[PDB]
């Protein structure tokens, strides 16, 4: 009855952009699920979330945010993990 | 619209 | 073409923070477009695509009296398991439905669906002939006779044959115009020198709509089963999606291999090279 959560970070837009930024959560359940994106960024909105055939929920989750070189962050709480998995970029 | 549902 | 109207229906316990949390999510040829959610502010059905906002008043107070009604029942449900399956009563469950059909070209219903999911896992469904049920444990099977008895089958089928479908007929015209939306894919090929022997070549395809693609990479007019690796397509956050492939090719020797993009608002397939 756990499944684990899949995770891709990446971009909207392909050094200074008015990229919004993603995090992109499938395959997973309980549908309870923390996800959490210099470090540790506010003002994250989340898409109202929705499952799929399989009963798999997902979400995705979008910042805003300009790059340059910092480094940008992903890390879900789940109750499939022991520890929140971390996640970085391209 | 959706159905109204029925008690398992 | 075909078409589908489906209800996506989730019930979430929450032990001791009180009432659980009740969805409906609404989707014409699986695109959402209305949505109830007890947890909003003022739960009330929702409008989610523009052309949803056609319907007047007395829809939205009529789905959202029947939502109400529908979350009511599914506190019932989720206590109603517990107790079929003796578990232990703190801990948070759920409850999903899929509720809906699929229409043909002539307008008849073609598929239909009503099924049911614990913790997960199937649960009971309501199989093709529109008339039997399938039952996934002993647990199910008490849900099974009790509709039995209670004509259930007859009652979902004269809603999937008839009201269904109608209402179906009443959101195609209206968002029809706005579904056929197509955007085409834009592509492109980049590199990336991998140490010590090898280039990746990654073909990127994005802002294309509907997310239904396919790439390939072919050497010399085959196609790379293997090497080839492959995201699950993604939306980029504004009504487009994403996806690439690409491989690891030896070097000066990029130029034998082609990329080539296949969806729905393309003339022709793409075909790319580095």
């Not at chain 3, 993604?234 to 030896?250: C, E, M, N």
């Amino acid at each position: 009855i756990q499944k684990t959560p899949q995770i891709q970070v990446y971009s909207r837009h392909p050094n200074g952009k008015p990229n919004i930024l993603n995090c992109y959560v499938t395959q997973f359940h309980p549908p309870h699920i923390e996800i959490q994106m210099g470090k540790k960024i506010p003002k994250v909105e989340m898409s109202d979330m929705s499952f799929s055939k399989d009963w798999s929920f997902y979400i995705l989750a979008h910042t805003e945010f300009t790059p340059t070189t910092d480094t940008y962050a992903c890390r879900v709480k789940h109750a499939s993990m022991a520890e929140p998995k971390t996640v970085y970029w391209d | 619209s959706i159905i109204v549902f029925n008690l398992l | 073409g075909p078409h589908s109207l489906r209800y996506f229906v989730t019930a979430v316990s929450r032990p001791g923070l009180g009432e659980p949390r009740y969805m409906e999510v609404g989707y014409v040829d699986d695109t959402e477009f209305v949505r109830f959610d007890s947890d909003a502010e003022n739960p009330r059905y929702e409008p989610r695509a523009r052309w949803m906002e056609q319907e007047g008043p007395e829809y939205w107070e009529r789905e959202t009296q029947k939502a109400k009604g529908n979350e009511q029942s599914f506190r019932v449900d989720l206590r109603t398991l517990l107790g079929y399956y003796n578990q232990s009563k703190g801990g948070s469950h759920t409850i999903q439905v899929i509720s809906g059909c699929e229409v043909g070209s002539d307008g008849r219903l073609l598929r239909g669906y009503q099924q049911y999911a614990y913790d997960g896992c199937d649960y009971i469904a309501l199989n093709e002939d529109l008339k039997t049920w399938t039952a996934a444990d002993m647990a199910a099977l008490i849900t099974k006779h009790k509709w039995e008895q209670a004509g259930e089958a007859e009652r979902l089928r004269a809603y999937l044959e008839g009201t269904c479908v109608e209402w179906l007929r009443r959101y195609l015209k209206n968002g029809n115009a706005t579904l056929l939306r197509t955007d085409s894919p834009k592509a492109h090929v980049t590199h990336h020198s991998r140490p010590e022997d090898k280039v990746t070549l990654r073909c990127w395809a994005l802002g294309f709509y509907p997310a239904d693609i396919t790439l390939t990479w072919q050497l010399n007019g085959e196609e790379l089963i293997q090497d080839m690796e492959l995201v699950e397509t993604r939306p980029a956050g504004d009504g487009t999606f994403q996806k690439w492939a690409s491989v690891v090719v030896p070097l000066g020797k990029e130029q034998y291999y082609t990329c080539h993009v296949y969806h729905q608002g393309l003339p022709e397939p793409l075909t790319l090279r580095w």
